[PDB]
């Protein structure tokens, strides 16, 4: 047999609507970088979460 | 079969005394941060039929 991934990427439902499930998915990053600037310009609610 | 070697990417060739050589490099980096080149990748390069 072969396992499968839990998510499909940054465009998954768990990253866009975390409150619509079980106790919410916990994801974060370290600020003051380039990934934070990339996420902030493309996703606002996800950036705040 | 095998791994990758001589990893180099594709580019747009332009002559040295070209006025457009600065505005093209600022448009490719801008299309990599807004998701413009991933629509072009999933449309022509990524329907894996078999
Ligand atoms: N390489 C990033 C920092 C590390 C990261 O954001 O993943 C920068 O120079 O801003």
Curated annotation (Swiss-Prot), chain A:
Glycosylation sites (chain numbering): 32
Entry function: Component of N-methyl-D-aspartate (NMDA) receptors (NMDARs) that function as heterotetrameric, ligand-gated cation channels with high calcium permeability and voltage-dependent block by Mg(2+). Participates in synaptic plasticity for learning and memory formation by contributing to the long-term depression (LTD) of hippocampus membrane currents. Channel activation requires binding of the neurotransmitter L-glutamate to the GluN2 subunit, glycine or D-serine binding to the GluN1 subunit, plus membrane depolarization to eliminate channel inhibition by Mg(2+).
Post-translational modification: Phosphorylated on tyrosine residues.
Superkingdom classification of source: Eukaryota
Protein family membership: Belongs to the glutamate-gated ion channel (TC 1.A.10.1) family. NR2B/GRIN2B subfamily.
Residues of the full protein shown: 657 to 705 of 1482
Binding annotation for L-glutamate: 34-35
Organs and tissues of expression: Expressed in the hippocampus including the dentate gyrus (at protein level). Detected in adult olfactory bulb, brain cortex, hippocampus, striatum, thalamus, superior colliculus, with much lower levels in inferior colliculus, midbrain and cerebellum.
Location in the cell: Cell membrane; Postsynaptic cell membrane; Late endosome; Lysosome
Gene responsible for this protein: Grin2b
Domain notes per entry: The extracellular N-terminal domain (ATD/NTD) endows NMDARs with a unique capacity for allosteric modulation, harboring several binding sites for small molecule ligands that act as subunit-specific allosteric modulators of ion channel activity.
Subunit relationships: Heterotetramer. Forms heterotetrameric channels composed of two GluN1/zeta subunits (GRIN1), and two identical GluN2/epsilon subunits (GRIN2A, GRIN2B, GRIN2C or GRIN2D) or GluN3 subunits (GRIN3A or GRIN3B) (in vitro). Can also form heterotetrameric channels that contain at least two GluN1 subunits and at least two different GluN2 subunits (or a combination of one GluN2 and one GluN3 subunits) (in vitro). In vivo, the subunit composition may depend on the expression levels of the different subunits. Found in a complex with GRIN1, GRIN3A and PPP2CB. Found in a complex with GRIN1 and GRIN3B.
Official protein name in the record: Glutamate receptor ionotropic, NMDA 2B
Curated annotation (Swiss-Prot), chain B:
Location in the cell: Cell membrane; Postsynaptic cell membrane; Synaptic cell membrane; Postsynaptic density membrane
Tissue distribution: Detected throughout the brain, in brain cortex, cerebellum, thalamus and olfactory bulb.
Carbohydrate-modified residues: 23
Modification after translation: NMDA is probably regulated by C-terminal phosphorylation of an isoform of NR1 by PKC. Its phosphorylated state is influenced by the formation of the NMDAR-PPP2CB complex and the NMDAR channel activity.
Entry text on domains: A hydrophobic region that gives rise to the prediction of a transmembrane span does not cross the membrane, but is part of a discontinuously helical region that dips into the membrane and is probably part of the pore and of the selectivity filter. The extracellular N-terminal domain (ATD) is a site of allosteric regulation to modulate overall receptor function.
Task performed by this protein: Component of N-methyl-D-aspartate (NMDA) receptors (NMDARs) that function as heterotetrameric, ligand-gated cation channels with high calcium permeability and voltage-dependent block by Mg(2+). NMDARs participate in synaptic plasticity for learning and memory formation by contributing to the long-term potentiation (LTP). Channel activation requires binding of the neurotransmitter L-glutamate to the GluN2 subunit, glycine or D-serine binding to the GluN1 subunit, plus membrane depolarization to eliminate channel inhibition by Mg(2+).
Assembly with partners or alone: Heterotetramer; the NMDAR subunits are modular and harbor tiered domains that function in concert to regulate opening and closing of the cation-selective ion channel pore. Forms heterotetrameric channels composed of two GluN1/zeta subunits (GRIN1), and two identical GluN2/epsilon subunits (GRIN2A, GRIN2B, GRIN2C or GRIN2D) or GluN3 subunits (GRIN3A or GRIN3B) (in vitro). Can also form heterotetrameric channels that contain at least two GluN1 subunits and at least two different GluN2 subunits (or a combination of one GluN2 and one GluN3 subunits) (in vitro).
Protein family per UniProt: Belongs to the glutamate-gated ion channel (TC 1.A.10.1) family. NR1/GRIN1 subfamily.
Record protein name field: Glutamate receptor ionotropic, NMDA 1
Organism field: Rattus norvegicus (Rat)
